[PDB]
Subunit: 447 residues, 3 copies
């Protein structure tokens, strides 16, 4: 893992390079079945406590079954509808007549089986729980008589253990309108997930990747409820396919860059916009503005292209030349010089203004650097914490090399009188045009 | 269900009509009691494992009881205080002396009972768990001797099952400062909720509505902890009363509308503001800006007026004439032409700019539409996915009719030199006044 | 508890005073160990149901152990890395050879013990669960033979109870990448937390404070996973140290202040910015802009300085003189006069504009106050609810004294023609300078 960082003194921004990205570009759906028992209440003369315990657990089984039924009778729309059409397409096929009977026959003797549906896909189905065999074989002879037979206490415990997975799956599907993410161990055990990864149409290097990051895989997966019909509970798990592997990725960090005059009210500020994760993707750059869309593990990043923006690759030139014409680099302006700090991958940017006490300390040496007014940076080599005012941040102690790219702060190139200080989604060149417009009103009204 | 949609080419916005709204306007509180056992530790000479299991579960019962006590001794304020005064008013009455004794007497023989409190309301109380009868009858003869009696293994399992609901209710009330939402199956089982709906002072059509959408009802309900006193645990469930039923509701979708010049830096943008859910409400329009405030089920919408804004009904004319003087329609401006798409109820708005590759595909036919630069729309009829750059969205496959309302994009009516490009919460007429002000500075400085 | 409030009619803002703050300034780490059993599968000829139940629970024990191992083999970075360096420093020491053996020896006979690590700290270690003794003593004689011995049903239940805490701790550490907050009862029981508070190097008054607010303490704590190695599961709990106790704190509430002309489009608005919690802190003021960073219990506030801004104490003069030169008080401007209300600690600010029906009611008297157009305030004395349009808010019924500070609304001091209506993070003096600039263009172009 070659993680490196670059602080640009001129724009008060840093870029953390060297990350290998795995971008989600496709979906792999799989059908998960639970064999249920079509057992209407069959209540008999019962008294001894083992029978009461069985009848109680049996009512919890019926309530979970009717709840999954009212969940499929009326399914509320979810904010995930734009990401689940593939798994939903499998559920719509399962609703066809005879289709639940097909998977019901293929999984008659085995747990796993490939099934060609009436919509063509050769989908892979599994069978993680068998309640029809247990209730109809171990319980009906106990409840299908004039008076109930006495089950042994081992059966009471075994039925509470088996029925448990059904109750938790019904709880998640009910509170989330049939669509859950991340995918829990109740929907798919770690053992079942690794077996599903092994059976995926991916390279052996991708199976090793998803198997070594199962929690991230779970967080980028969906579990979709299909149907309860004819003693079968089926639901689709939608797993990520990372069509982009090992693509270069980097993270942009930005902090306010103000002037440091001694008279308050005479200072102007500037901040680069669009901080977050950038990855090379198909001749363009995929930008992820939201913080939860990229999970990081050491050297590696796992992003979902669902919540990304597609930018031309020239967007990276804002990191090397912000005044560069191939790309209109974006900034925001204000006159709000409040001190702050940003913890980067290998150090910390500190924007210190006013009377704020900014410093960087080592746990055993004490304060090793005092920041003056302006925007500065310190590496994690020898630094443990950074204090800005009354706030103390912890520096990431990850190994890597930092580079301080010295340069004049670009905020000094601007005349304060004509500066646009109210700008939000503004470009470097847009700001220069507003300055030419305020300068033309004085050029004409001097001549 | 008559769901229809209208895309306005002129403003790059769409309106999804035909939804029937159910707006929350009132609250129905109900008291939920759990009979507890005032049993101080009564530890005796115990050794056999059944006694250990009982004593362990009994300590978990005392810790849950003392935790509910420290929860009512000091109750942290919650961000829900502006929505729970009705249920809280019932809890303040329960704290009166003799009032817990009243409900304790009315529920002596039955589970449900109406109780007239010392604040007048005829409230409906229930009794979902009876631990006083079970501990004092089944457990004290086992622990109230010199040496403990041996309980059978059926009692150990039955006590872990009954004590379980207490522990989960105490967990939710403890982590949430006594106020939980949504209302879980631990606070109120699906069986108890449907019975509470049946006993509500609502029409039979509203009971069928809440009973068919119990999860949405749960998400729009509160469970408030009252008091633990004199062998009684009481808490109030605050359920929604939908005074507005079947009111017309619609959803506004907006997307950036920019000019498409070939020289970057010469383009101006405009976006309609206030996207979200609108419902007719009491001679006005209730607007819901936040995304989680309206749950949708097929044709129907369930909103809470707690987080809504009240607008004049003329706000709908921004959908028919945005240049119309009865209402100052709102826009935001910029020069940020980044491509994007919005998945609507029956199609997709696509704002394509620059070199971005925007398209709409069918699963079996491939690309069926390529968007050019500007703002456009495509219906879900025959369309499965929409790609903008490296991002792929899924189109909602819901049945309904779309209408493409052709019209000149209003961004073309604006001169770029005098356009206000930094506007956030700006009106159509506000922007026109800023244009008259920049045009007067050139009219006077030409004459 | 002396809670008081002050409404400033001139700026449409209120300040709730009298709160005693407890600001987190340090961390107290403690090591929590669980003795595990290094037991490879030792599967034997087993058939009777008690053996099946044991073997099932034993596989759930191994899966939880391997999951904690893959969690420590690859630990994903978390957004909490800037707040956990202290507890992480203890985990890095535990990874040293012989260091897990040290705590393994000190806790050989007792549950609690102070341990001097190979990094100096005298840390306090505990031992909350002993699975090595239970599996190796109660289970291996049952599974380490040619054919498995029959365990009694008491052992099956006791092992499911003991193994349970391991499975829930592994679930939380797995889904959260080894760092959880708040700290659950699974990580640390209420009994263990109070005992940890008693053993803390704090005054007796701080132990009473944290013990009376354990849920807030839990919400401001972290549980960090260390290592699984040599039959020991260790994880660090990072508890808050409140170096600031009983410091004066107050909460600023702001609401839009517009003009009330009868011709729409001629009104200008202004809103004070930086609403939230303020606390005196080390010669400065700690401001908390985010809503979840301060938990309130009656009179008291518990904040974390991690997400605060440090402001000069002159920031309070925006509450007494907003036109005052020692501090540049901040405002935002617009022309968006939409009615709204803010529920304060002791009353409600109501900003009423247009045709909106704003009122304040008592539950038994009905409407007791009708607001006219402008910004106004009403105390909670005699008031239960406040209605703005179709929205009804509940007034906090907390006891305290309100003071209505009468004054001319400052929005009336501004000429509408030259007002800057697009301002976001703007100062009072910044706005005055933009007004001098628009007035100079007319002074020179009249002369
Ligand atoms: C003003 O416009 C000219 C175009 O001739 C350009 O070269 C110059 O950079 C502009 N001024 C500023 C301050 O950007
Ligand atoms: C300028 O003001 C006049 C008022 O006489 C108005 O009719 C016109 O629409 C305004 N101009 C623009 C571009 O809105
Ligand atoms: C204009 O500038 C002068 C400085 O001489 C200042 O005193 C005055 O307050 C400014 N005007 C406004 C409206 O703030």
């Amino acid at each position: 893992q070659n993680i490196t960082e670059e602080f640009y003194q001129s724009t008060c921004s840093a870029v953390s390079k060297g990350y290998l990205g795995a971008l989600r570009t496709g979906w792999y759906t799989s059908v998960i079945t639970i064999e249920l028992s079509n057992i209407k209440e069959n209540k008999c003369n019962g008294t001894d406590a083992k029978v009461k315990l069985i009848k109680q657990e049996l009512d919890k089984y019926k309530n979970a079954v009717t709840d999954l039924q009212l969940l499929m009778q009326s399914t509320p729309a979810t904010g995930s509808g734009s990401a689940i059409c593939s798994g939903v397409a499998v559920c719509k096929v399962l609703h066809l007549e005879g289709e639940v009977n097909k998977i019901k026959s293929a999984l008659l003797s085995t747990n796993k089986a490939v099934v060609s549906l009436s919509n063509g896909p050769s989908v892979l189905t599994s069978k993680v729980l068998d309640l029809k065999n247990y209730i109809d074989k171990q319980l009906l002879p106990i409840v299908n008589k004039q008076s109930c037979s006495i089950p042994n206490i081992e059966t009471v415990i075994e039925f509470q253990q088996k029925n448990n997975r059904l109750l938790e799956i019904t709880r998640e599907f009910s509170v989330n309108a049939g669509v859950t993410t991340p995918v829990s161990t109740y929907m798919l055990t770690n053992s079942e997930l690794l077996s599903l990864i092994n059976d995926m149409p991916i390279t052996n290097d991708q199976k090793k990747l998803m198997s070594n990051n199962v929690q991230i895989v779970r967080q980028q997966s969906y579990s979709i409820m299909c149907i309860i019909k004819e003693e079968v509970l089926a639901y689709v798990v939608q797993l990520p396919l990372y069509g982009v592997i090992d693509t270069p990725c980097w993270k942009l960090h930005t902090s306010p860059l103000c002037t440091t005059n001694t008279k308050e009210g005479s200072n102007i500020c500037l901040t680069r916009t669009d901080r977050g994760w950038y990855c090379d993707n198909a001749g363009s750059v995929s930008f992820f503005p939201q913080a939860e869309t990229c999970k990081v593990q050491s050297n590696r990043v796992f992003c979902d292209t669902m919540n990304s923006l597609t930018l031309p690759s020239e967007v990276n030139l804002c990191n090397v030349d912000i005044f560069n014409p191939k790309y209109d680099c974006k900034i925001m302006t204000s006159k709000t010089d409040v001190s702050s700090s940003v913890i980067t991958s290998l150090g910390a940017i500190v924007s210190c203004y006013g009377k704020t006490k900014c410093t960087a300390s080592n746990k055993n040496r004490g304060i090793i650097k005092t920041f003056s007014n302006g925007c500065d940076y310190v590496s994690n080599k020898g630094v443990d914490t950074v204090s800005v005012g009354n706030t103390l941040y912890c520096v990431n102690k990850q190994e890597g090399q930092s580079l301080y790219v010295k340069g004049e702060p670009i905020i000094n190139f601007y005349d304060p009188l004509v500066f646009p200080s109210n700008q939000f989604d503004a470009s470097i060149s847009q700001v220069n045009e507003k300055i030419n417009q305020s300068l033309a009103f004085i050029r004409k009204s001097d001549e």
